[PDB]
């Protein structure tokens with residue numbers, strides 16, 4: 001970026017929401033960051049359009065955890081979503097689990113443990129176990145990621161594009 005990232009983000013992991021409320025012509029600096037991060041994740045995921053942007057973060061109830069170091073390394077975006085989830089008895093149930101919506105580590109530093117670092121921090125602040133999560137179209141990398149770090153192995157295939165794991169049916173999800 002053309003800005004003092006460390007001045008804007010003093011902390012290693014910055015937690016932001018619909019209010020890009022800085023840790024205001026730098027609340028616009030936050031925007032440019034979210035906007036570029038989202039496009040980078042799109043290119044990495046072979047998406048024609050980003051699923052993360054400033055315009056959209058403002059229009060939703062999503063939380064982004066931005067990772068920096070001592071230059072933005074990556075991010076993970078989460079949110080609670082009303083999903084009507086298929087169980088093992090072909091029954092659909094309304095739940096509101098915490099969902100992983102976007103997740104990106106810059107290519108140069110992928111597979112250095114930064115994903116886990118960002119993921120553990122999110123799990124701690126959100127106070128959730130990995131098996132309570134629903135994931136929006138997990139990539140092959142994310143599936144191996146989740147299996148190594150948390151022993152997550154896919155359960156009942158959904159008809160929506162979310163994926164849940166063995167253990168999901170244990171919480172009430174509000």
Ligand SMILES: CC(=O)SCCNC(=O)CCNC(=O)[C@H](O)C(C)(C)COP(=O)(O)OP(=O)(O)OC[C@H]1O[C@@H](n2cnc3c(N)ncnc32)[C@H](O)[C@@H]1OP(=O)(O)O
Pocket residue numbers: 041044045100101102103104105106109110111112113114115116117135136137138139140141142144145146148
């Ligand atoms: C819900 C969503 O947002 S879906 C899409 C998820 N995002 C993407 O696929 C974008 C590109 N990928 C990435 O940004 C990151 O790989 C994720 C996917 C963000 C992983 O972040 P990382 O920081 O690389 O992971 P970290 O080093 O913490 O963990 C490594 C583990 O993740 C998996 N992993 C990461 N990259 C790869 C790869 N190219 N091939 C296979 N497994 C991989 C493996 O389990 C690996 O463990 P191993 O090296 O012992 O096999």
